């Protein structure tokens, strides 16, 4: 079944996009390159997460 990693990943992207609307989530801990997280960082990170979702949406439709 190749619908698995596309499924797995759409949950994972959906939730990462939801969690980042919380400024105290553990989801901000994955950014080990950035020393202290400024707001302009969280700006670009919410955008990258939303892009990463719309791709995972397109890739799950294609396997569903």
């Amino acid at each position: 079944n190749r619908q698995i990693p596309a499924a797995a990943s759409l949950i994972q992207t959906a939730w990462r996009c939801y969690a980042a609307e919380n400024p105290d989530s553990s989801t901000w801990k994955i950014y080990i390159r950035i020393s202290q997280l400024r707001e302009h960082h969280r700006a670009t990170i919410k955008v990258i997460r939303r892009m990463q979702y719309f791709v995972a949406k397109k890739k799950f439709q294609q396997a569903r």
């Binding site: 990943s9 994972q12 700006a43 939303r50 949406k57 799950f60």
Partner: protein, 144 residues
């Protein structure tokens, strides 16, 4: 919803951050500088994937109107797709996933979330003691 507010102000600063050179357009390079900046190592395959999903027309770059459309986004339809994606790991399709299974796929495959995000996630659904997690609960909690 409502007419967009002073979030206009916010989204344009956000578009500013990717639009390093102010040409009113965001390119794969531009998205790639930002992501590597973030310690991420994306393929020129992946960048073009992200770009295409928001380029309303096909000039191959993102303007601000397209950007706005993207940051302003689907009733039950987006809800049903996540609800489906769980049903893929619903073995019997009862409507519950095990905590261990949930934890496992969440940690071991796909985007491989961290052990401490799965914790925040299992913890957001107050399990009925040691019980199986109702994922339809999850999906409503997520979308609303």
């Amino acid at each position: 919803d409502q007419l967009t507010e002073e979030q206009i102000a916010e989204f344009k600063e956000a578009f500013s951050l990717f639009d390093k050179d102010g040409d009113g357009t965001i390119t794969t390079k531009e998205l790639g500088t930002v992501m590597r900046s973030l310690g991420q190592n994306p393929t020129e395959a992946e960048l073009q994937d992200m770009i295409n999903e928001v380029d309303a027309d096909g000039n191959g770059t993102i303007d601000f109107p397209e950007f706005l459309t993207m940051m302003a986004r689907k009733d039950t339809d987006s809800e049903e797709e996540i609800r489906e994606a769980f049903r893929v790991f619903d073995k019997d399709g009862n409507g519950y996933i095990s905590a261990a299974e949930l934890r496992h796929v969440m940690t071991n495959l796909g985007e491989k979330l961290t052990d401490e995000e799965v914790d925040e996630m299992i913890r957001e659904a107050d399990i009925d003691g040691d019980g199986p997690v109702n994922y339809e609960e999850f999906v409503q909690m997520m979308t609303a």
